[PDB]
Amino acid sequence: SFDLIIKNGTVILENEARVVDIAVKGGKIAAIGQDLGDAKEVMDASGLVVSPGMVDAHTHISEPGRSHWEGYETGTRAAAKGGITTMIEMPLNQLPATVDRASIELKFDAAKGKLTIDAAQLGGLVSYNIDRLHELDEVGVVGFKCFVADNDFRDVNDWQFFKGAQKLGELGQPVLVHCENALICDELGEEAKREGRVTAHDYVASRPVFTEVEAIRRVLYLAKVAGCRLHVCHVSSPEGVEEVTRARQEGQDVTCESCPHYFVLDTDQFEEIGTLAKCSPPIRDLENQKGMWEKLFNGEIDCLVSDHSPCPPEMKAGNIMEAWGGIAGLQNCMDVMFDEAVQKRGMSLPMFGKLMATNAADIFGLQQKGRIAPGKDADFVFIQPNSSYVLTNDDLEYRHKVSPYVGRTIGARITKTILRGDVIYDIEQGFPVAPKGQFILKHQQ
Amino acid sequence: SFDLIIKNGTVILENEARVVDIAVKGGKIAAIGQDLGDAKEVMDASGLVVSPGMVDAHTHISEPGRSHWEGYETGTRAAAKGGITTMIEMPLNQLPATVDRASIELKFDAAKGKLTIDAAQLGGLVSYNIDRLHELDEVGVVGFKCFVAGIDNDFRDVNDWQFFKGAQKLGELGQPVLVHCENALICDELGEEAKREGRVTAHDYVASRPVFTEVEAIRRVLYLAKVAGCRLHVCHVSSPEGVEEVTRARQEGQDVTCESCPHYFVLDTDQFEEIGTLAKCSPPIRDLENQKGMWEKLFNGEIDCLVSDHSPCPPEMKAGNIMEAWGGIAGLQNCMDVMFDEAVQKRGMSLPMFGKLMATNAADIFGLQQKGRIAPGKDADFVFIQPNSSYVLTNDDLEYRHKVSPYVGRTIGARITKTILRGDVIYDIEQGFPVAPKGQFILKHQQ
Amino acid sequence: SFDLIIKNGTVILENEARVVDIAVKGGKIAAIGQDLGDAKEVMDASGLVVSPGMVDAHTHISEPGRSHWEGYETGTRAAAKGGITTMIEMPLNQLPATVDRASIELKFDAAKGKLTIDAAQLGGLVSYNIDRLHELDEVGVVGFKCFVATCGDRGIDNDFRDVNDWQFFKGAQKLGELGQPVLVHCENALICDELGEEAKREGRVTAHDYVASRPVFTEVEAIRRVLYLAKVAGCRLHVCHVSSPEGVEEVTRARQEGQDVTCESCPHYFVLDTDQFEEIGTLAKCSPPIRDLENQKGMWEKLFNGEIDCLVSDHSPCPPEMKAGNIMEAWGGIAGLQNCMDVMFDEAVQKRGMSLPMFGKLMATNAADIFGLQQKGRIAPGKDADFVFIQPNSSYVLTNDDLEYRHKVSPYVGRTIGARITKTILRGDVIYDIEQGFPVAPKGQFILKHQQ
Amino acid sequence: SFDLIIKNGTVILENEARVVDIAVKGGKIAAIGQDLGDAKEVMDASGLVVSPGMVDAHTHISEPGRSHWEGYETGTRAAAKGGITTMIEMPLNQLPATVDRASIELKFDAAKGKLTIDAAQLGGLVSYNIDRLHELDEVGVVGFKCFVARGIDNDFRDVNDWQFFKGAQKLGELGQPVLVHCENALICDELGEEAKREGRVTAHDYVASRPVFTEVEAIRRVLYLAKVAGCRLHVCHVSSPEGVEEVTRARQEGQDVTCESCPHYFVLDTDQFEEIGTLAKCSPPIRDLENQKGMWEKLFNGEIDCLVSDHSPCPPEMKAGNIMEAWGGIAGLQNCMDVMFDEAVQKRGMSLPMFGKLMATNAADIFGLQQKGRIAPGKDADFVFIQPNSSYVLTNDDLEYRHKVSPYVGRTIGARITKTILRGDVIYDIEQGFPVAPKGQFILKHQQ
Ligand SMILES: [Zn+2]
Ligand SMILES: [Zn+2]
Ligand SMILES: [Zn+2]
Ligand SMILES: [Zn+2]
Ligand SMILES: [Zn+2]
Ligand SMILES: [Zn+2]
Ligand SMILES: [Zn+2]
Ligand SMILES: [Zn+2]
């Protein structure tokens, strides 16, 4: 007897989308097909798309220490409402930063009973743990995040990057990198402030494309020489993507990601919205956006992730140059991209499924996640196409109910989210069950 | 309920191989998973690999005119015994060559009741049909084959202008062009030269078709196809240098795919010398270092499909020395088991990569919506492969019309135990061929 | 003491153009500098540019057999009046074609005393002499010219014939072994021929129709094919008259990868475009076609970027009867030998600001260096005293009567040209003077590779 | 009448080497050819190669302030003895460093009467003068040197990525090239410390602590930042064919970049370095013979624009200690021409006119020295006479440096400098030493 059968949905499979039923047993996808028979429970997905749960490879929760920025409780409720069933949690903003076993075990205690979704873990590669990267590897982190160019996050200089990447290469861990030449970016920003240039266009001119390209080029070469697998975080320009593409076409093991706000917003809209649209690699002009869409449709951008980066509203007050950078968008990755990629620009459903879930799970070794296939976790989002709503602040489950998407007309709706076989979010019910999420550790799956 | 359930096999799915049951209804995959329930018939696939049936994108049958070379009866039985469930049939050797509605309708009639497997069809782009390419597009070929620079109904090569113009037309119709890429002039003149010198060993024959003759032809057709706006498929690539040309072009955005054949991964010029004219084929079997590079390209994902280029001929055309003998490998029956042994068992290729190379990639390139993958709603086309189970291939084993092959005498480390086409066992290692031939032609606009 | 001193000119040296005097003795440059002393004769070059005389690496004279198209007598007079002092003569359209020792010796005999300029020689690599290429290498040709047709076109016995891919590869291999460069007319002839037939069939016979029937990709395909075959055969390659920047880009990429390849173009691809072709008629029809203005702008950037090694005439005259008919029926070829130096000086240097030493390399030094003409192409001590004096900012309207070709037609007639050839000096003697005409008997000689 | 005629030498002209005479008047080349006539003085170059004087684009003299490392007096005598007639002086080691008008004018005062050769000038692009680059441009430096990455005030200091980008952007505006020492200094330092920690301090350990990839990374970074800034770039002393290849790739894409190397990277290898000790230690390190084979191929392929000394002397006390502790730098100013003539022309078959370009003409053209680098009418009469197939063993006593040490001491060198001529006067002669008071002059960009 199956625990559950989802019937009549347009199911996103590896190869195509088609109307098929999904049988579920013990939290796992037990069968896919027709005439699957009887089950304790039956769901009608007629007229909906059944996607694999989003796998968000770039999520800041920052609980231990900076929990008042978001925290697990609100952060993962918003994730589930946004159709995210697995997040890959960054090591930073949390204090202590997640850099060794004690720091990650501290966070593990902090999270007990608060996980509404499943969560794999990224370790930090920082200046003060190059000697102890094996610790988080043993615990089962799925990658290490660093920034280049006392329990808080710190960047690494060129030598600390090369040495840490060398070690990570030996351990089988990928390095993830925020690629901006921050020295040049800081100094251009100071220059703009001195001159009283603090518009959105001024801020973007202060983080020009070449500062992304230089940093991607440096990181690519050092990671190659170190023998380390590489993932380039939130690429903001098609020029940055081309660097990654050129490297892979020469045989380098490198992947990259972007975020919905580089496909759906632009500098002119960033000006109108204000500091809620400020983020570190900046939202560039519309011609840049067009390039990014072409890269995405060309297959050069492996994953779409949130870079959910909230902060208390006092840090968003004031002019754009002094404000804290970060987009609160975790809840609107799936519906906004389905509307903008699938409905408006004609992207195929299985390509959507790859960009929002499968690729990330394959890159980070999440064996049970990312695909509607026999034996994987029964993690789904039901999406209602051609069903619009205007997003408002009290739709948001964030701790701080703000987002540069508030007031946007969004052409599709998350109607339901299912994690390992149980409905964790329902547009008609809210959150019907106690937090059932679990951490995912590499050697424990 | 379900007509059939295949249980306990290691199934090659798109993403991974795993032990799951397959339910079948009406020639179609009805479900995949566990506890699928009741069925009229149940197969036990324990200890076997259940692969999508091979989609062989490059098969010569040659039935009207040159049926005595192979023909539909023997050729498709060999294919089903080799674990191939869909062939994509070349338009040459048959007479009339398959170049317009009349010639293909002729063939259709000749083949009635003889198809043991399913067959998509290739048109020929030749010198005398440039203006009627739309005819075979209407019938529903999935591509057009040509050879780039006799009998009025035979196959003919096209010069550079006929290629460009034909490809320009095909690009408008949404049809790929498939090309045998060698500079035939240089290969012919080097061959005569070797003949005149009395240099007629296998090594001489390969030296008379050097790598640069394949690279030049590939570079020429890549550029002409690009300027013509036509999707291109480069047939049987024999060198990694040829593969590199295709890779470089795709990396620049050109819509091009390529294929190779088991004899370029499993045989080399030294074994070719030992075997003789049965190992002679047109793009030649090259040396062992070439082979090693070939394996590296395959494991790197630069070769889209593995195909047979099954090319038998009456034995008298294999008599004589290597330079004068007819070129062609009779290998239709041993693509799947040889390749499973050499790629999966001996070199560690993953089951999903093997499934993509032998079936899924070819199905996706030629638009065979129902074939090539174990997925819900696709045709229930499978091969059961028994790993780590060896046999010595003999002529008696061969279902070809001419029971010869350069693989005879080889120890092959895996066995094809069963072949299922649209839900029915068409070949079984123990029962032989249990059902009347049930194969159908596959036409592009009718699925 | 010196035979001659040329004083006060702006002399084009390899590195720069400066006012220096030139001393000549025994037909050779004996010294360069100031206060050179006494000489049997003095010329004033004030206000003039003193350039190396042009080295035209692509001239059709066709004398033995098709002399009535041009021939040595008129052809080299026109060359001298155009400021050319060395030509590198093609093996066609002469009959017999220059393909072996017997054919070139017949030609040497016919040319005796008719050379107004010096002439290095190119052999033909043709379908029927691949086994005899050593003969012309021994004689001393400086290179071998061929047309590559995948099939091999129609032709006359003893005439220039195209080579198929095999013949090109085998010949190129032998040329690589002899140390001889292969020169190639790079156009896919079949595709151009068939598209031309298409146009005629459709009633489309304008100049724009002709250019569309020889599209850029037919040039690029042929260059790519020849680049690769010559590479494999191990042969130095020169790509003749490139008509498009896409063709230049193929040559550049090959060189950047280390291939030994050079290329050239012609003044008509820099100074005419298809719109002027349409107004001019068949006199501006040529095989690699004159393309549109956007193409011309790209050619100018290639040239200024150093990607085109040499400028040559491709002087391709024919009897005017062969210029009758519509553009698709007429014989291709530009009669332009007389107006390479002054048109290009005007268009490159005056109008577009090219440096005088770059002008000198493009018109003379690079060709001399590529084909190993040790005595030619540069104003340097010990080289031949070969010069042309050019008067800048001095214009004239070209008339038929100015032309010294056998057939006094050219697409440049009626053109306003902003500089003038005032004097041409060959091995220390005035052979052409704007005021005197041709003052001495023809003194030109053949230049042979091993007898320099 | 001419002041002088040099007769019967094999003269390296731009296009070829051939026997011709050179007439000189007023310190300039008046004529080249035969039968030039009478002169006040005649020299017999029979049997010698008459080359343009070397143009050394990378010289450290360090006079105002660190004169005791070398100084103009001994430095320029050694240059002249080695056949160098123009040096392009680096802004570093001297104190104050050459970074603005006051520091260079201070330098001009120290040099008076000490210049045996001519000296064009490089400025420093340093952390603290980015807003004042126009001053040295006005004075007439021919480029600006920097180190992209800690020092003395008024000393030479590194620039960070931002200072390099902003400075390069200004320099592109002024029409000045930027010259860069290209090593990832952080990674070299840290690997070097590692070596010491582990007790690994041989020459082979030092080279492995400055791996090729630290050169390639730094060149790639600078290539890309100079491009974005719009600045012409010169890459200093490349040590590896991998670094050259980065430069060649960028040029082939249209970037205006040039590079140089030094004799020690063609003529020494790490195994010799080990036997020599710290006198052969240099910042871009002398690599293994297989690397050296690659460098010779790059050189013969035209991928390296000039050869320069990177003369980097120091008091011998700084050469004490093991290889990891000693000060890096090669004292080799005196043995650039004769060693490269031997190794390149006599041993490896390089053409004389290519030698001329690599040792002189390219440097003069890159840095806009209109009067220098080539034997041609109207240029300065700067020559060196080289005697081929004439060998000698270098001794400490041969050296004119302040500190008479060099990693070439005791080496066999198969050609000899016999005469150096500067603007028409013999300033060095193997038969008479230095027969005229110092007559060198500074060369300023806007005053040639
Ligand atoms: Zn970030
Ligand atoms: Zn982030
Ligand atoms: Zn074939
Ligand atoms: Zn075939
Ligand atoms: Zn031509
Ligand atoms: Zn011609
Ligand atoms: Zn340095
Ligand atoms: Zn230095």
Side-chain angles (χ1 to χ4, degrees), chain A residues 1-2 13-16 18 20 25 30-36 248-250 367-368 371 373-376, chain B residues 1-2 13-16 18 20 25 29-36 251-252 369-370 373 375-378:
Chain A
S1 153
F2 298 124
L13 303 175
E14 194 94 4
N15 48 310
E16 61 183 6
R18 66 182 305 134
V20 282
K25 174 90 154 294
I32 305 170
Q34 55 163 120
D35 320 332
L36 297 185
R248 311 163 78 147
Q249 286 177 349
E250 292 165 335
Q367 139 120 186
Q368 295 306 128
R371 43 168 58 83
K376 308 295 175 180
Chain B
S1 61
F2 295 136
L13 302 172
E14 252 201 297
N15 43 311
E16 62 181 9
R18 77 180 299 132
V20 289
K25 198 179 205 262
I29 299 155
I32 303 164
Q34 316 288 1
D35 320 330
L36 292 188
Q251 283 171 349
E252 296 166 327
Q369 193 215 124
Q370 284 310 122
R373 44 167 54 81
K378 300 311 167 169

Side-chain angles (χ1 to χ4, degrees), chain D residues 58-60 90 92-93 145 147 181 236-237 260 284 309-312:
Chain D
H58 196 142
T59 323
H60 294 279
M90 280 297 166
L92 46 150
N93 295 13
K145 214 323 192 35
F147 286 66
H181 175 120
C236 289
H237 45 47
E260 72 192 16
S309 67
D310 195 12
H311 185 59
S312 288

Side-chain angles (χ1 to χ4, degrees), chain A residues 58 60 90 92 145 147 178 234 307-309:
Chain A
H58 191 143
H60 305 268
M90 287 279 161
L92 55 150
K145 221 311 218 51
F147 290 72
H178 179 124
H234 44 49
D307 191 22
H308 183 68
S309 209

Side-chain angles (χ1 to χ4, degrees), chain B residues 88-235:
Chain B
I88 304 182
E89 180 196 353
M90 286 283 165
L92 56 151
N93 304 359
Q94 57 258 46
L95 289 163
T98 303
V99 311
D100 56 23
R101 177 173 319 260
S103 55
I104 206 177
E105 293 191 333
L106 277 180
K107 209 174 57 162
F108 283 172
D109 183 73
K112 287 312 91 142
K114 304 195 199 139
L115 283 190
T116 290
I117 67 169
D118 283 356
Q121 297 281 285
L122 293 169
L125 163 67
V126 291
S127 54
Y128 54 87
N129 81 331
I130 307 293
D131 284 324
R132 320 175 266 132
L133 298 183
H134 68 272
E135 290 190 24
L136 282 182
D137 179 61
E138 298 173 19
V139 175
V141 303
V142 289
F144 286 75
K145 218 298 194 65
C146 63
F147 288 76
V148 285
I151 293 143
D152 307 277
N153 238 331
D154 216 341
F155 201 85
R156 284 321 145 191
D157 53 270
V158 288
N159 61 32
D160 291 346
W161 163 248
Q162 297 156 332
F163 179 74
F164 175 76
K165 184 167 144 182
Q168 195 162 66
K169 189 64 219 262
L170 296 170
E172 303 183 349
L173 301 163
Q175 288 283 353
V177 67
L178 292 72
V179 185
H180 174 123
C181 291
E182 298 176 291
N183 191 302
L185 212 223
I186 299 183
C187 291
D188 290 345
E189 292 291 359
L190 283 176
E192 298 308 304
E193 196 169 272
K195 269 133 99 159
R196 291 190 290 260
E197 308 188 357
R199 276 189 303 105
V200 300
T201 81
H203 285 88
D204 292 304
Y205 171 74
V206 178
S208 83
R209 311 189 81 85
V211 168
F212 83 84
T213 67
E214 171 177 273
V215 167
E216 190 282 312
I218 288 171
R219 281 163 71 71
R220 181 190 311 194
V221 304
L222 277 166
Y223 185 62
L224 286 179
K226 176 168 72 149
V227 168
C230 192
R231 168 152 75 92
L232 170 67
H233 183 73
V234 177
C235 292

Side-chain angles (χ1 to χ4, degrees), chain A residues 219-275:
Chain A
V219 150
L220 279 170
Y221 184 63
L222 288 178
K224 169 148 74 144
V225 174
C228 192
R229 183 152 76 91
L230 172 60
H231 183 75
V232 187
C233 291
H234 44 49
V235 180
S236 68
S237 62
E239 285 79 6
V241 183
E242 176 54 25
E243 290 309 315
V244 174
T245 303
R246 175 207 34 89
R248 311 163 78 147
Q249 286 177 349
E250 292 165 335
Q252 191 169 347
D253 195 359
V254 50
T255 54
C256 74
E257 75 186 23
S258 204
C259 313
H261 43 279
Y262 308 112
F263 295 91
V264 154
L265 297 177
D266 66 50
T267 310
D268 284 347
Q269 308 175 282
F270 170 15
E271 200 69 81
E272 282 200 295
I273 296 149
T275 66

Side-chain angles (χ1 to χ4, degrees), chain C residues 140 241 364:
Chain C
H241 45 45

Side-chain angles (χ1 to χ4, degrees), chain A residues 398-419:
Chain A
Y398 310 145
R399 180 160 295 289
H400 303 295
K401 284 145 153 56
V402 303
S403 179
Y405 303 129
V406 168
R408 176 178 199 101
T409 291
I410 301 179
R413 308 219 66 184
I414 308 293
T415 73
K416 197 176 290 203
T417 306
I418 289 166
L419 167 64

